[PDB]
Write a protein that binds this ligand. Structure first.
Ligand SMILES: *O=P([O])([O])O[C]C([C])([C])[C]([O])C(=O)[N][C][C]C(=O)[N][C][C][S]
Ligand SMILES: [Mg+2]
Ligand SMILES: [Mg+2]
Length: 85
């Protein structure tokens, strides 16, 4: 699957709302689609699905504020934050 699409798939599942696909510029936190619990769930799901570890200390609601921006952040971090054998 396309990386962006697979990320949006995970996000939609954690948010339990496909709106994150329909409008990838929706303000996730301003619209209450995700809370702190959901943020942890999301980061854990990302590591499980992609083996990309995003430390909670790196997450910023202002930077990871829309589906598009989350996809973009993960894209930037993918290489350096992937587990190493
Ligand atoms: O990290 P946040 O989402 O901003 O935390 C919000 C808090 C501070 C209000 C937090 O205590 C909280 O979410 N309480 C509700 C119970 C819960 O879900 N705790 C786990 C937070 S990841
Ligand atoms: Mg937080
Ligand atoms: Mg950090």
């Amino acid at each position: 699957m396309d990386f962006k699409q697979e990320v949006l798939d995970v996000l939609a599942e954690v948010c339990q709302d496909d709106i994150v696909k329909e409008n990838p510029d929706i303000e996730i936190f301003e619209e209450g689609l995700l809370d702190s619990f959901g943020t942890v769930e999301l980061l854990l799901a990302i590591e499980n699905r992609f083996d990309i570890l995003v430390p909670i200390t790196e997450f910023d609601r202002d930077v990871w504020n829309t589906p598009n921006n989350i996809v973009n952040q993960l894209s930037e971090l993918k290489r350096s934050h992937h587990h190493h054998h």
